[PDB]
Amino acid sequence: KGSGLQGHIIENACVHHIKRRDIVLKWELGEGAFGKVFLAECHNLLPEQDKMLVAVKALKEASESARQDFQREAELLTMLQHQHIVRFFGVCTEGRPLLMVFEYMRHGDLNRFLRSHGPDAGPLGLGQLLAVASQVAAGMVYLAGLHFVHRDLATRNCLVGQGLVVKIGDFGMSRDIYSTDYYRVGTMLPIRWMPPESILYRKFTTESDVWSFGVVLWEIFTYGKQPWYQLSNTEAIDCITQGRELERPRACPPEVYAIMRGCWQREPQQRHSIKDVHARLQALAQAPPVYLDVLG
Ligand SMILES: CC(C)(O)CNC(=O)c1cc(NC(=O)c2cc(-c3ccccn3)c(Cl)cc2Cl)n(-c2ccccc2)n1
Ligand SMILES: O=c1[nH]cnc2scc(-c3ccc(F)cc3)c12
């Protein structure tokens, strides 16, 4: 198992328990090899809300090892509390399937949102793209502050709620729903988002997270296009290990492309810290550069 949650547990809460009958399953949001994700109504969870919408992750396996891993993940999810981290509400361990309850983010994953609010399928403007980038960076600042390495930072692993609120978080099904974004070697790795040291040594750090954040900026400013989309997985590995960089997207002002390039320094020690990246994006989101994508 290679989730960022398990990776943090290995390197390092009173979990709230929700009664099964308080959860009313409404629709299936997705499914993977591990189980299913549902849209549900949850009673007795938030004070002024009787039928609040939640997203419910259901685990197919209920063995002793999966049950102990589930408990440790739930203790860690309970501890993660930030305005730009998806809210975790608790568990239901009344037999099979084990359930994890999260807030429901009505606009779905950020990749799906960017593609549905993009030009080739109105379009999000420069100020909205900068606000999305700044919120993702805020969530990454919080995780770096806890020495938490994400390991799979990408727009598919961010969620969008009402009022353009963007949060980091996923229901653990990206390797199934977005299998095209991963490549097997031995273990499914998101190679298009990884720096050279992670593809070569399979080592993930706060520095490889900053590189992936640079790739997130590129996804944002292309409205959700796949990095290196013209190339196969093996050709993408060669580009990255040879030191080739993604081209500046047309909607991307040179000022944001300079931030992307600072994330993509070949030497991990030469990359910008996420705190510096966040401060630069926050400044641009409050005062957008006068850039007209039509004029290049
Ligand atoms: C083959 C496998 C096992 O490898 C596939 N399983 C996975 O690939 C994978 C990746 C993740 N998600 C995380 O580990 C992860 C989750 C969050 C977060 C925080 C708050 C709310 C929601 N989500 C945040 Cl902020 C950062 C990370 Cl890095 N899985 C996951 C997700 C939710 C619960 C349990 C596991 N499973
Ligand atoms: O999710 C769906 N997709 C397509 N047709 C249907 S009919 C019913 C559902 C459904 C209702 C509640 C659930 F907890 C899960 C699934 C459904």
From Swiss-Prot:
Residues under site feature: Breakpoint for translocation to form TRK-T1: L5
Residue numbers annotated as active site: D152 (proton acceptor)
Outcome (variant: D109N): In CIPA; abolishes autophosphorylation
Effect of R156C: In CIPA; processed as wild-type but shows significantly diminished autophosphorylation in both neuronal and non-neuronal cells
Compartmental location: Cell membrane; Early endosome membrane; Late endosome membrane; Recycling endosome membrane
Consequence of changing G90R: In CIPA; loss of function; processed as wild-type but shows significantly diminished autophosphorylation in both neuronal and non-neuronal cells
Ranges facing Cytoplasmic side: 1-296
Post-translational modification: Ligand-mediated autophosphorylation. Interaction with SQSTM1 is phosphotyrosine-dependent. N-glycosylated. Isoform TrkA-I and isoform TrkA-II are N-glycosylated.
Site (Interaction with PLCG1): Y291
Positions bearing Phosphotyrosine: Y178, Y182, Y183, Y291
Binding site for ATP: L29, G30, E31, G32, A33, F34, G35, K36, V37, K57
Stated consequence of mutating K57N: Loss of kinase activity
Tissue: Isoform TrkA-I is found in most non-neuronal tissues. Isoform TrkA-II is primarily expressed in neuronal cells. TrkA-III is specifically expressed by pluripotent neural stem and neural crest progenitors.
Domain (Protein kinase) ranges: 23-281
Induction profile: Isoform TrkA-III is up-regulated upon hypoxia in cells normally expressing it.
Effect of I199T: In CIPA; partially decreased N-glycosylation; reduced expression at the plasma membrane; reduced basal autophosphorylation and complete loss of NGF-induced autophosphorylation; loss of NGF-stimulated calcium flux
Residue ranges of the motif DXXLL: 50-54
Disease tied to this entry: Congenital insensitivity to pain with anhidrosis: Characterized by a congenital insensitivity to pain, anhidrosis (absence of sweating), absence of reaction to noxious stimuli, self-mutilating behavior, and intellectual disability. This rare autosomal recessive disorder is also known as congenital sensory neuropathy with anhidrosis or hereditary sensory and autonomic neuropathy type IV or familial dysautonomia type II.
Notes concerning its domains: The transmembrane domain mediates interaction with KIDINS220.
Family, as annotated: Belongs to the protein kinase superfamily. Tyr protein kinase family. Insulin receptor subfamily.
Chain's role: Receptor tyrosine kinase involved in the development and the maturation of the central and peripheral nervous systems through regulation of proliferation, differentiation and survival of sympathetic and nervous neurons. High affinity receptor for NGF which is its primary ligand. Can also bind and be activated by NTF3/neurotrophin-3. However, NTF3 only supports axonal extension through NTRK1 but has no effect on neuron survival. Upon dimeric NGF ligand-binding, undergoes homodimerization, autophosphorylation and activation.
Summary of subunit composition and partner proteins: Exists in a dynamic equilibrium between monomeric (low affinity) and dimeric (high affinity) structures. Homodimerization is induced by binding of a NGF dimer. Interacts with SQSTM1; bridges NTRK1 to NGFR. Forms a ternary complex with NGFR and KIDINS220; this complex is affected by the expression levels of KIDINS220 and an increase in KIDINS220 expression leads to a decreased association of NGFR and NTRK1. Interacts with SH2D1A; regulates NTRK1. Interacts (phosphorylated upon activation by NGF) with SHC1; mediates SHC1 phosphorylation and activation.
Remaining remarks: Trk also stands for tropomyosin-related kinase since it was first isolated as an oncogenic protein which was the result of a fusion between the tropomyosin gene TPM3 and NTRK1.
Protein name, as recorded: High affinity nerve growth factor receptor
